[PDB]
Each structure stands twice: as structure tokens, then as C-alpha cells.
Amino acid sequence: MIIANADGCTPYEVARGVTIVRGEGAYVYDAEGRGLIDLSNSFGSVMLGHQDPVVTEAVLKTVRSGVPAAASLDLQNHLAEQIAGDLPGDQRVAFFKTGTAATRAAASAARQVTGKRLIASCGYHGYDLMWEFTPPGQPNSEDVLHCYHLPELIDQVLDKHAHELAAVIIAPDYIHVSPEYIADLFERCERVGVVTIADEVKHGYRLRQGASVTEASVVADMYTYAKGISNGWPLSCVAGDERFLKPLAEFVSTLTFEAPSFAAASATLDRLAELDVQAQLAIDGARFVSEAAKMISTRDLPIEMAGTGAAFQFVCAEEVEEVLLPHALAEGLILEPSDQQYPSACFRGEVVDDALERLDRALTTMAAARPDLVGREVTQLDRVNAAFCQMDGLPGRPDGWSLDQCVEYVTAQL
Template identity: 30%
Template sequence: MNHPLPKSAELNQRLHALIPGGAHTYAKGSDQYPQALDPVISHGRGAYVWDVDGNRYIEYGSGMKSVTLGHAHPRVLAAVRRELDRGSNFVRPSVIEAVAAERFLATVPTAEMVKFAKNGSDVTTAAVRLARAATGRRLVALCRDQPFFSVDDWFVATTPMAAGIPDEIAALTVTFPYGDLAAVEELLRRHPDDIACLVLEPAAMREPPPGYLQGLRQLADQYGCLLVFDEMITGFRWSASGAQGLYGVVPDLSTFGKALGNGFAVSALAGRRDVMELGGLRDHRERVFLLSTTHGAETHALAAAVAVMDVYREQDVVGNMHALGERLAAGVREVTEAMGVGEHLVVRGRPCALVFATLDENKQPSQQYRTLFMRQLILNGVIGPSFVVSNALTFAEIDKTVDVVAQACVVYRKALEAGDPTPWMGGRSIKPVFRRYA
């Protein structure tokens, strides 16, 4: 058959010839999309993106969940442009570094100090190093039920893509399941003086069980380790101050990114002053090489972050995203039930961070059915690896998405009745990001 996206196909060939994996983020790879329906994006505005072939899509999961205010948000761009005219990087700190730090600590009042960087991996790895220095311990305990924490060895060693990481490094990371305090306590008892920190997303696909986060706080105090919250997704989605602000549990360290810059590269390590000062110049203890990056305080990225925080302070961004997500979840559930696929095509998660699960005729997770479903969405003008909303969406786009899902359900039901989605996949199946071989 003719390729439905000829310009994208040509560009994908160029990308794969020049870039390992064809993209700079594995989750954006062609293998995450149906065959021949892996559009290359030309530009975005608000809740829409356009590909190089001229097609417009309603977009979900914008920028790996980083663009909550919508693409090319005018207020954020105005702040960035002002700073670009002043220069972006100097040999000494810029005034915007103080402004951004003050604004962040006012937004996340559970933290006492903050240091900015570019990527989430930068700051989560810095948190681990800081925890090890503060406690004098080796082991990192992380939540194994959550998909991603860092590109660095301490985390990647726990995935199927652990090639290149020595076993000695992998042995320094242990894991625990989400929501099970007894399992965490047992882990701490097995390593009573060797776990430096507990690392987890405080909330994700399901709400934390009652008392769970509070229990982690108590266990960390009891066993002398630090509690580290990865707020990359929960920050500026669950609330502007993250899950720690919503649930009232204060971690020792926390990391933010993604929505903090509305797509611009900025992340933050925040936490207790006595711990953070280990990486500073006002402490008598042995120094920690915490974060020292050439581009960590680029003025335009910090200006973007300040503008984002100002918008969140003045508007109910989180409340609106929840309302959008609630309407989307209700609509999807209604049409899937009406089409008889409600037990196979399932929407899950907090309204501001919805995902869809594609289950086969035996109600087991299926990448083949995911391929079929995403193919129908893309062909009908909806793109995204999830149903994670942005504030730029309106009820009109939500209702259009529900209509597209209803059309996809017709095909989904045919595949279930046939017991084989292959004829409707359009080619090879989507693959998991973390796999041992390409």
C-alpha cells in the first residue's frame, strides 16, 4: 500500500540514519506507534500539533506530559523572548536565578532550598548522591511498579535494557512494590544500616492507600534513610506543589521537571536545607558535587518556569485539567460500554493523567490491540501514547476525541470477535520501550 504519510516516512529514514533509535527520547520512537503512522511533527499550538504532511491532530501526553499549558503558550513565550534579548548564559549567576528560586519555593513551600538543572534524570540522580552522602549508606531503594526515574545506572540497571552496567552497580539498587508498607519495612529490616533513600513517585496510576505516604515518612525516620519524591509528573498536575502539597507529606528531597517549564528544559531538586547545603559553600562537612551544569540556569528556561508558576498562581490550571479528564474518562467509558468493549478498552488513572489499557479477548494487556487502537486514533486526528490532558484542551476537543474512540471501538469489537487483531493493525505491533533486544 502507499504510505499515508510520505514526508514523515522520508524524514523518519533520515532520523534513523543519523540518530540511534530515530529520536532523542525512546518513548517518541517509531516503534511506539503503528507502522507507517509515526508522523514527524512540524509544529504545535495549544492542544494541536501538525505533522510535516499537513495533518492536524488533537494531542495528548504533550511533550511526555511536560506541556500542561499548551504548545506555544503566549505568556511563556513572551517571558522567554524577553530573556533571550538579554543573553542566555553568563560567567556568574543571573538575577533570574534568584527570582526563579524564590518563586519555586513559594510554590512548593514544603522545600527549603532548590537547585535547577535541565532534565529529570539530572536531579533524581543528584538526589540519590545527596542521600548517600547525608547518610553514609550505599543502597538505593526504589519503587519497582513505576516506569522511569533516570537514565543513570542506578535506575537503568533495574530494567531489561541494562547492557553496559556492571553487576556491582546493579547490586546497589533494591526495589519495593507501591502501596505495601509491610514490604518496605521488611526491606529496611533486611538492610538496616545500608539503605540511603526510598525513591518513588508519591502517586501514579492509583491514589496512595490511606496512610501509605505517612507510613513511608515514619519508616524513613525510624530507619535513618531519606524519603525522596519524584514529582516529575505529579508536580503541577496533582497540584502546583505536587503530591506532597496535596497529601500533606513532606519528603526530605523531591524532584520536579516536565510541566515546570511547559516544554522548556528545566528541572529542580528541592528539599531540606541541612541536606541541600551539603552541595553548597556554607557547610563544614565533606562537600557533595551536587549539580554543576553549564546550561542548568539558562535564563530563558528559568523565565519560562517563572511564567508557568505565575499562570498556575492566577488560574485554576489543575482544576481545569481535572474537569477535562473527568469528561474524557466518562465519555470513553460510556462509548466503550455501549460498543461492548468496556472490559477490553479501559481508561485508568487520575483525571489529569489518564492512560488507556488495551486488553485482548482474554482480558490480558496486548500491544497488538494497542497498535490497532492507536492506528484508529491517528487516522481520525487524535495522537498520543495516553489520554493525559493539557489545559489547552476544551470540552469541544474532548467530545471530538470521544467520537473518535467510538469509531475505534467498532474496529476493536471486530478484532475481538475474530480473536485476532492482526488484520486491523496495518503492520507490525508496537513494542515496549524497555526490552532487551530491538
């Protein structure tokens, strides 16, 4: 009502008809005491699980100490060392409170160093007007051009503007395109001498202990993190070469160095390593996705599974998704719509079996409630729409599509 910015783009929208009051591990609990397996995890900000006991103990002890902001420089420096040590090369780290602040800061540093203004972008980099999507070839109000993960559109912007780009910022994604496809986007920009920013806000510390692009054989001038590093506490950063981080020396807020979020983040990174989280998720998520695909097949429902491990998606028509999501919720399974799912470290062992049993029940009630969906086919356009929702770009030019058709498609999505 009176909150202006509580519309969409908030997690748990599927549950807006129920009341969530508690979270613990892989589960959240509604007002009636029912437990729901959570595959939203605050849009992937909770990588360890709700109320992780080590993170919580670290936060509680920091709160009880009352230590004020910007006094625990030892802890702050230790966290910067943790982050920099997981990236190849020599990095400095500048801390922020949201992913949007980190990506705008990285863009601002590129502008300061290069003396140029134009930025090219693939993917979603946050809510700031500078990241507002406009059609290909049309700079937005803050002089950002959007290329929708297509190498042909990157090539077009580089052909016309390589000499005047401050930077290219790319949010990687690997559900609908390969690591090699993503690496190719970075390398096109590197070959013409343009600064690169790997926006790892979503995938940093989710797919491996560090930046996802590192395993794609990419190195970038600057990296931005947020969701993976702090288990739901507001902390983000830009990590990158000294030349780009020096312009961020005065990019400080009163509470940049409030202590509880630093305690949470340092504990989170340690716990991710101790519990082998990303490698175990690769195993447990792959089991979930494989078994989910089998259950879908035996029921002839029009859903395809895409991705694996820590990042997978139920690919289907919007009409089908609008049935799957409530049926899953009725069986105690929270899914995010129009996006990947975001399992946490607690999505292991018996929890995966529990989630599959709930999905099994949901697919059965869905087939019985909506028998007209049984036998429906998943179309190319279904898959493209699902990819565009998840990665905010096209998964390469779809088969049989001209580049002009790609441009008209993305224009129609805005």
C-alpha cells in the same frame, strides 16, 4: 541510523509513520496539514499547551536580549522562591537540566549527608545506570535496590538494611493505587529514620500547584521536579531541606543558568496558577474519562478506563492496545502506549468534545475492523500488566498472588 539514543523511550512513537511539523495548543499538525489532538504532550512535559503565548513571549524576549548564562540571578532566585513557596517548610532549590540529573543529585546529597551508600527505590527515576531495575533483593551496579511499590518489599529492605540506607526514593502514582497507599510507603521509611526523596518529576505541578504527595499528607526531605515546571524547556530541580541542599552547592554545569529555560519555567508556574490548570484538568479529564468509559461500554470493547483528571490510562491487553492506538491516530487522536495519557491545560472546553468525537469514531472503526475483539473480557493479568507499564511497579499485591508470585512476575518483566 547514526543517533545512538533515539530508539524507544521517546514520545510520539505511535506517529512514527507520519510527519509532525507544528504544535499549537492542544493540537499538533502533520505535513499534510491535518490536526491531531495531542495526549502525549512530550510525555507530559507540555502542561500548558504547545506555543503557549505567555511562555513563548517570555522566551522570545530573553533570546532577543542575548543575556548570557548566569547573569539573571534575579529571575533565577525568583523561580527558586516560586518552587520553595509551594512546599511546606523551609526549602532551598538546586537546578538541573533533566529529571535524571535531579534524581541522581538528590541521591548524591543523601549519600553525602548520611555517609551511607545503599539506596532503595520505587518507580522510574531516569536513564542513569543507578536507576537500572534489578530483581527484588538484588542491588544494581550503583547499589540501588528496587521495591516495585510493594510495602512487603520495602519492609524487607528496611528489615535488612534500614541502618545502612542513605535514602529511599519513591515516584508516586495514583492511577492504580490510592494516595493512602503511597503515603504508607513513605511513612514506613520515616518510621525507621531513613531519608525520603519524593520523585515528582512526573506529577509535580500536574495534579496540583506543587508536589502531588503534599495532598497525600506526605512530607519528604527532598523533592525532584521536571516535567510540570517548564512547558517543554529543559529545566529540573531538587527542592529540600537546607541540610540536604548544602552538599549540592557545587553541582553546577556551564549552562545550568541559561536564561531562556528559566524564563519559560517562571512563566509556566505563573500561568498554571492564573489558569487554575490542575483543578480544571481534574474536571475536564474526569469528563473525558467518564464519557470514554461509556462509549467503550456501548461498543463492548475490551478496554477499561483507569484514573481521572490529569492522569488516566486506557487499560487493555497489549493485543488490544496495538489496535486502539492506530485507529485513534487515524481519527486524529495521539495516545501514548503502555502509559497514562498527559492532557495539558488546553484540554478544556471544546477540545474535550473534539477528543471524544474522535475517540467515538476510532472505537467504531476498531469494532468494525476487528469484530473478534468485541465481547472479549479484560483479565486480572491485563490490569496488572497495564499498571506495571504505567507506574513501573505493582499496584499492591494482586488478589490471589503470593509475594513469591509478585517477585517472579516483576523479575520476568526485566
